[model samples]
Target: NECVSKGFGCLPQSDCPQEARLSYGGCSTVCCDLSKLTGCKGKGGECNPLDRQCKELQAESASCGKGQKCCVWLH
Candidate 1:
């Protein structure tokens, strides 16, 4: 009960096809491969990287050819 929805709104699968920029309620370390991505996320909305573990995950999508990927560090 301590989660802030940001209320940016929920994005559908279409908008998030490639680099949808996904975001979940309390999931920070989530990089499950968009091609077969699952088990993480809520709506395709903006991200506050700050809400997650380490802000370093922002660079996770650098190597991605399509939708930028997010990688979390081991804490």
Candidate 2:
């Protein structure tokens, strides 16, 4: 539970700053990052570097941006 410390994780069907799945194809690790990404837009697919999905890390804390309304995204 890496993200646990961060306060986040894939956690299978979870949300807060919206919620998304890393087209990872399998369930092993929940990833989440906060850098530069498009809002859910009803569709958030893929991460960076080794793109696959844009959801990772079970952060003891994870979020997308600032002043974001609750569940702004719904991927």
Candidate 3:
């Protein structure tokens, strides 16, 4: 059956194996499609916007350490 999982943002609906119709608040399983997110393509982990690739946030966190400021995206 097809059900609409409505919550947060607009997401595509998915089909279920069940015969009964149902509505859900969110996806039963969350999927992160790297291809859809910038800086996350062709990588296997968290993405670093600075290098345009995946990286450990901790590795670069030191560069902006303590009271220093850092620019970030609002989106």
Candidate 4:
């Protein structure tokens, strides 16, 4: 079947690979520069270097709580 491109897959600045483009939504790329991005607490945000994926420390009182984790690439 013919491949299709989707969000972020076809970056406004550059084109993504065909395999990645086949994904319905945006696909994660190793091209992200963590040093230049931050404040990724919500969805569709960037991932920190330590996690390797976008995540938030869901704590009720500054203590460990249920962590909400999501793939940063889909954003």
Candidate 2 to native Cα RMSD, angstroms: 13.7
Candidate 1 lDDT over residue span 1-75, tens digit each? 112333332335454444544445443432222423332132332223344452333434444444444543211
Q: Candidate 2: where are CA atoms >4 Å away?
A: 11-27, 33-75
Candidate 1 clash pair list: none
Consecutive 10-residue window with the lowest summed lDDT within model 4: 1-10
Q: After superposing candidate 3 on the true structure, give the runs of residues whose Cα lies further than 4 Å from its correct spot.
A: 1-32, 35-56, 67-75
lDDT of candidate 2 over 9-73, digit per residue (tens): 45434542444443333335445432213443323332233233334442211353332222223
Among all windows of ten consecutive residues in candidate 1, which has the lowest summed lDDT? Answer: 31-40
- Report residue 16 deviation for candidate 3 (angstroms): 26
Q: Runs in model 1 with CA error above 4 Å? A: 1-4, 25-75
Question: What is the lDDT of every predicted structure here?
Answer: 0.36, 0.36, 0.32, 0.32
Give lDDT for model 1: 0.36
| Tens-digit lDDT string for candidate 4 (1-75) | 111222122232244333332333342432322222323332334323433544544332123233344223334
lDDT of 3 by residue, 16-44 (tens): 22322234334454322222233322232
Q: Tell me which of candidates 1 and 3 scores higher on TM-score.
A: 1
Give the CA lDDT, 0 to 100, for residue 63 in model 1. 46
lDDT value, candidate 4, whole model = 0.32
